[PDB]
Amino acid sequence: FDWDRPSYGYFSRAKVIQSAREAPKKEEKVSYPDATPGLPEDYPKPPAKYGSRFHWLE
């Protein structure tokens, strides 16, 4: 056949190839709409109401 013996590592390299099956699985991110929320840094903080709101305000 006059074929040539491949290199020492001709198959050791990566194999970058063409796509024939053409089935890339879909890259997706999960969504939990009702996750537990906290207090954003933009939520207005009106200065406190009724001191420390403790027994005698103190």
Partner 1 sequence: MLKIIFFLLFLIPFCFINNMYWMVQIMMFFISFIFLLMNNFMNYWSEISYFLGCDMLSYGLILLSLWICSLMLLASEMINKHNNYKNLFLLNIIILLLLLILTFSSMSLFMFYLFFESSLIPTLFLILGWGYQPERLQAGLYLLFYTLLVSLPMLIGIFYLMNKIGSMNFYLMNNFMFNYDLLYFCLLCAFLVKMPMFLVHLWLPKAHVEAPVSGSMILAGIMLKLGGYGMLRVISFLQLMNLKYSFVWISISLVGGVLVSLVCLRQTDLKALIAYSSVAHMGIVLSGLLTMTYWGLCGSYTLMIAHGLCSSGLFCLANVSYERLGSRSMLINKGLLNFMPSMTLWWFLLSSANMAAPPTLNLLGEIYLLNSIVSWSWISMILLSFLSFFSAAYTLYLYSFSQHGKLFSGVYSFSSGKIREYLLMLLHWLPLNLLILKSESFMLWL
> Is 56 near partner 1 (CB under 8 A)?
yes
- Distance of closest approach, residue 46 Cβ to partner 1, in angstroms: 22
**Backbone angle region of 57, left / alpha / beta, with phi > 0 → left and psi within -120 to 50 → alpha:** left
Whole-number minimum distance, CB 28 to partner 1, in Å?
49
Minimal distance, residue 45 CB to partner 1, in Å? 25
Amino acid at 36: T
25 binds partner 1 (CB under 8 A): no
Residues with Cβ < 8 Å from 57, sequence gap 6 or more? 50, 51
Q: What letter does residue 41 receive in the DSSP assignment?
A: T
Q: Which residues bind partner 1 (CB under 8 A)?
A: 55-57
